[PDB]
Each structure stands twice: as C-alpha cells, then as structure tokens.
Amino acid sequence: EPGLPPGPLENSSAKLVNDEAHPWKPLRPGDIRGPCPGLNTLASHGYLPRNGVATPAQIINAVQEGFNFDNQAAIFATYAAHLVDGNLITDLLSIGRKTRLTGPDPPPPASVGGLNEHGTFEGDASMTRGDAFFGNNHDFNETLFEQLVDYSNRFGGGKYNLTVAGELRFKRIQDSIATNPNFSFVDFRFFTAYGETTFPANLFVDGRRDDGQLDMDAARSFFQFSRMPDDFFRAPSPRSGTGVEVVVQAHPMQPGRNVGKINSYTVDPTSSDFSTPCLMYEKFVNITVKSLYPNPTVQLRKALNTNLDFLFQGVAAGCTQVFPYGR
Ligand code: HEM
Ligand SMILES: *[C@@H]1O[C@H](CO)[C@@H](O)[C@H](O)[C@H]1NC(C)=O
Ligand SMILES: *[C@@H]1O[C@H](CO)[C@@H](O)[C@H](O)[C@H]1NC(C)=O
Ligand SMILES: *[C@@H]1O[C@H](CO)[C@@H](O)[C@H](O)[C@H]1NC(C)=O
Ligand SMILES: *[C@@H]1O[C@H](CO)[C@@H](O)[C@H](O)[C@H]1NC(C)=O
Ligand SMILES: *[C@@H]1O[C@H](CO)[C@@H](O)[C@H](O)[C@H]1NC(C)=O
Ligand SMILES: [Cl-]
Ligand SMILES: [Mg+2]
Numbered sequence: 345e346p347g348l349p350p351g352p353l354e355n356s357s358a359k360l361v362n363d364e365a366h367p368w369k370p371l372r373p374g375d376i377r378g379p380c381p382g383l384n385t386l387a388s389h390g391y392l393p394r395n396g397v398a399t400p401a402q403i404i405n406a407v408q409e410g411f412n413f414d415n416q417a418a419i420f421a422t423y424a425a426h427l428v429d430g431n432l433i434t435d436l437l438s439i440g441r442k443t444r445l446t447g448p449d450p451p452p453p454a455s456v457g458g459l460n461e462h463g464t465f466e467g468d469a470s471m472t473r474g475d476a477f478f479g480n481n482h483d484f485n486e487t488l489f490e491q492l493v494d495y496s497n498r499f500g501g502g503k504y505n506l507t508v509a510g511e512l513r514f515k516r517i518q519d520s521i522a523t524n525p526n527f528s529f530v531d532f533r534f535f536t537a538y539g540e541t542t543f544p545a546n547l548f549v550d551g552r553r554d555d556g557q558l559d560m561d562a563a564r565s566f567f568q569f570s571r572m573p574d575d576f577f578r579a580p581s582p583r584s585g586t587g588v589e590v591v592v593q594a595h596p597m598q599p600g601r602n603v604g605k606i607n608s609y610t611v612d613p614t615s616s617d618f619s620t621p622c623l624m625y626e627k628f629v630n631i632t633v634k635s636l637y638p639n640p641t642v643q644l645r646k647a648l649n650t651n652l653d654f655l656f657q658g659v660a661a662g663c664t665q666v667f668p669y670g671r
Contacts (some may be wrong), residue, residue, distance in 0.1 A: 349423070349654050350404045352415040358551030358580035361410050362572040366390050377570060378440030378459040379466050379473050379482045382543065384570035386410050387439060396439045397446060400426045400654070403437070410578060411547045417584035420658025423651055424532070427633050428464035431456050432647040440482060450644060454636045464632070467533035468524060469516040471541065472567045477524045484568045491515070492567075493560055503557040506587045509541040510594025517597060521609045527602040530615040532628050534599045538592050538618075539585040546586050551577040556587075592618055621661035629655070630668050645669050 362368075366389040371377065376396030377384045383403065386392045391406040398406075403422045407413035430437030434447035438458030449456050459466060462476035472488050474480055492504065492512060500508040517537075520527040529537065545556045548566050550573065565571045599615035602608045616624035629652060637648055648669055656665045 348401065349419050349657060350401055350408065350415070352582065353408050353412070356412060356580075356582050358412075358554070358577045360575065361391075361578045362389065362574065362576040366410075368571045369394065376438050376440040376443060376458070377482075378438070379470065380439060380459060381472075381566045381570065382407060382411060382413070382547070383439045383459070385566055385572060388570040389572060392439070395445070397436055397443065398439065399435050400430070400437065400651075408582070412551070412579040412582050413547065414582035414584050416658045416660045418658070419654060420660070421536075423655040423658060424628065425459060425465045427648070427651055427655065428636060429456065429458055429461050432644060432651060450637075451641075453638070463528065463533075464636075465532070465536070467537065468527050468529060469513075469520045469537055471512060471516060475520055475524045475527070477526045486568075489564065489567060492563065496560060496563075500557070503559055504544050504563055505556050505558070506542065506545055506590050507594075509545065509587075510591045513538060513541045513591055514595035514597070517595075521602060522606055525602050525605050525608075527609070529597075530599040530601060530612050531624060532632065534615065534617060535621075535624055539588050541591050542585050542587050546583050547579055549579070551579040554580050589618070621659075622663035625656075625659050625661070625663055626666050629666055634668055640669065 368389055375394060377387065378396070383392065386406040387394055387396050389410070391410040392398045392402055400422045404418045407418045408415065426437050431446040433450065436446040438446055440458050441460045442457045446456055455461055457464070460482045462481055466481055468475045471492055472484055473482060474485050474488070495508050495512045495515070496502055496504045499511050517529065544558050544563060548562055549556060549558050562573045565573055598611040599617050600609050600611040603610050616627060633648070637644060640648055
C-alpha cells in the first residue's frame with residue numbers, strides 16, 4: 345500500500361515545528377526517553393507518542409515532519425532499529441529502555457530491548473552518552489556535553505559545525521580505545537557513529553538560517569532537555585548525513601574493536617566501511633538480524649520479511665536486496 349512505509353513529505357519547506365499543536369511537556373511517570381536526542385525531542389513535543397513507545401510509521405512521519413529528515417534515511421534507521429530492538433508482531437518500538445508496553449515478547453534469543461539495547465543500534469563513542477561498558481548508555485552526560493562545548497569553542501568559533509564534528513568524533517573514538525576494553529567500532533555502528541555527528545549541524549540548526557552552525561543553547565536544549573528552541577523552524581529541505589565524508593576524513597579510521605583490553609584496537613578486515621555500504625546492509629540482515637531471529641516461527645518469519653522489505657526501501661546506495669529468510 346502507498347504510505348506504508350510513509351513516503352516523502354508532500355511539502356518539505358521550512359516551517360515552524362515548535363508550534364501550538366506540539367508543545368514541549370515534562371515527562372510523566374513511566375515516559376521513556378533514550379539515547380537519540382532527535383526521537384526524544386519528537387516525543388517530548390508530541391510528534392511521537394509522549395510515553396516513548398511508537399510504531400515504525402509514527403517514527404518515520406515524526407522525523408520527516410519535525411526535522412525534515414530525508415525519507416530513505418528515515419526508513420532505513422527506523423526499520424533497522426525496529427528489526428533489532430522492536431516487537432515485530434505488535435509493531436511497537438521503545439525509544440529507550442525495554443518495556444512490557446511493547447507487548448508479549450518473542451522467544452529467545454530475541455531481546456526486544458528498545459533503543460537502549462547495546463550493540464544492536466546503540467553503540468560506543470557517542471558524543472553526549474557514555475559507552476554501555478561504563479553502565480549508562482542512554483542518559484545525557486554533562487561532562488561529555490561540556491567537551492562538545494569546548495570543541496565548539498576551539499574549532500567552531502563557539503558553534504558546533506562539521507569541523508567541530510570531525511575533531512570531536514575522533515576524540516571520542518580515542519577515549520573509548522583508551523578506556524573501554526569492549527570497545528566495538530565496526531559495521532553498522534561505524535556508519536551511525538559518523539553520520540550522527542553531522543545531524544546537529546544539518547537538523548538542529550533553525551531552517552530559516554540553515555548555515556550548519558549550531559549554537560550551544562540549542563545544542564543543550566536538544567541533547568539534555570529534548571526541547572526545541574523557541575520558535576524553531578525545521579530545515580528547508582529533506583536531509584540527514586550531509587557532509588559525513590568531511591567528518592570521516594578529518595581523522596581517517598579503519599573499523600575495528602578492542603579485544604578485551606584497553607589500547608588493543610584491532611582492525612576488522614571483514615567489516616564494512618563507507619566504501620562498502622551494500623556490505624553493511626547485507627551483514628546487518630544476514631548476521632545481526634539472524635542472530636536475534638535464527639529460526640523464526642511462520643508468523644515471525646512473515647513479520648521479519650515484511651520489515652526487511654521496508655528496510656531495503658531505505659537503502660540509498662546502489663545495492664541488491666538479500667533474503668535471509670527466503671521469499
Ligand atoms: C529516524 C529514526 C531514528 C532512530 C530510530 C534513531 C535512533 C538512534 C539511536 C538508537 C542512537 C544511539 C546511537 C549512539 O549510540 O550514539 C541515535 C543517535 C543519535 N541520533 Fe538518532 N535516530 C533516528 C533519527 C534521528 C534524527 C532525525 C535525529 C535528529 C533530528 C537524530 C539525532 C541523533 C543524534 C544526535 C545521535 C547521537 C547522540 C549522541 O551521540 O550523543 N536521530 N539515534
Ligand atoms: C508549503 O509550506 C510552506 C510553509 O508552511 C508554505 O509557505 C507554502 O505555501 C506551502 N506550499 C504549498 C503548495 O502548500
Ligand atoms: C564486556 O564483554 C564481555 C564479553 O567477553 C561481556 O561478558 C561483558 O558483559 C562486557 N562487559 C560490560 C560491562 O558490558
Ligand atoms: C560522564 O562521562 C564522563 C566522561 O567520560 C565520565 O568520566 C563519567 O563517569 C560519566 N558519568 C556517568 C554518570 O557515568
Ligand atoms: C566551523 O566554524 C569555524 C569558525 O567559524 C569555521 O572556520 C569553519 O569553516 C566552520 N566549518 C564549517 C564546516 O562550517
Ligand atoms: C547474505 O545472504 C545472501 C543469500 O541469502 C548472499 O547472497 C549474500 O552474499 C550474503 N551476504 C553476506 C555479506 O553475507
Ligand atoms: Cl525525503
Ligand atoms: Mg552510544
């Protein structure tokens with residue numbers, strides 16, 4: 345059916361998104377927020393359900409409407425997250441912690457852990473969240489945010505921009521290598537870790553300006569409080585990871601991992617990287633999804649195949665679809 349998954353916006357102009365129909369509200373008891381400042385902000389303004397549990401279609405519509413996230417990027421991220429962290433039978437995903445609100449769980453080894461689940465979507469060297477190894481991969485960390493402010497002062501004239509992103513991304517990688525014996529920086533996380541550092545410059549900057557320079561009040565508002573600036577206009581066109589190549593090239597890194605000790609970063613020659621986007625997709629579906637759903641029942645297999653078809657619609661690179669559970 346058309347509109348499943350949601351298609352691109354009919355009208356993708358800049359407009360007021362912090363409007364009277366979408367007020368910021370504080371959390372009620374039980375409301376879930378997680379490691380994504382974008383989704384957190386959409387939930388706290390009511391572009392998504394305010395309790396932080398949503399369907400993939402709700403998430404895709406929200407990121408497009410609220411931030412002008414581009415359609416393919418929205419589809420890929422949402423169905424990737426849903427496949428590994430969401431309930432495929434009830435069609436619900438938590439944007440944070442695991443919750444009974446996503447419905448009766450599937451059999452092990454599937455975890456349905458929400459976006460807080462480490463190593464599926466969420467991973468190491470986040471800008472404002474700590475690595476899961478240290479015990480909290482989802483809450484805003486003030487010390488890490490102050491480092492973002494310091495890098496913005498040093499490389500962005502007090503604003504966050506792609507130059508700042510290139511330097512901060514590398515700093516966070518180096519700090520995880522030095523401190524986290526389980527540091528993993530391969531495949532899907534290698535991709536998302538770099539792309540996410542562009543998002544504040546591309547999507548948190550008011551759309552009437554759209555100059556790639558994010559002020560620190562706005563940065564704190566999104567990253568800490570899940571709140572849009574007063575009178576915030578979304579970006580004037582659909583985008584996501586514009587300029588990711590600049591961030592990647594600031595300090596070229598190979599994908600790899602620490603091997604159970606600090607300072608043991610070992611390149612993984614089997615990992616995808618930005619030269620092999622189709623390999624990233626194929627490994628995600630053949631390996632990561634299969635590790636959660638190795639031998640699904642008929643009902644789960646059907647749900648997997650539908651969501652995998654939707655995932656493939658989000659692949660922006662020139663790739664062939666693969667079928668880990670046949671056709
Ligand atoms: C389209 C659906 C999306 C999903 C399911 C999603 C989910 C996630 C998840 C699970 C993370 C954790 C990655 C990590 O370990 O650092 C993350 C990172 C992030 N996402 Fe999203 N995201 C989405 C779209 C967006 C959008 C539209 C924005 C901005 C408008 C955004 C901004 C961010 C930022 C800034 C980070 C990194 C935060 C940090 O490192 O401190 N995301 N996302
Ligand atoms: C598109 O939306 C913008 C902002 O709401 C508005 O200025 C413009 O007139 C709209 N165009 C159409 C054709 O609806
Ligand atoms: C580190 O990795 C090991 C796998 O060898 C795992 O058992 C352990 O839970 C990880 N530690 C933390 C704190 O996440
Ligand atoms: C916040 O991050 C800093 C810098 O990595 C870390 O030293 C500190 O333990 C983190 N705070 C919490 C509560 O984990
Ligand atoms: C970041 O800001 C600095 C200082 O204003 C500027 O020199 C640099 O060109 C900016 N980078 C980008 C990508 O806008
Ligand atoms: C994924 O599985 C398909 C067969 O279903 C195969 O053609 C493809 O090469 C596999 N890709 C990887 C990276 O394992
Ligand atoms: Cl689009
Ligand atoms: Mg993380």
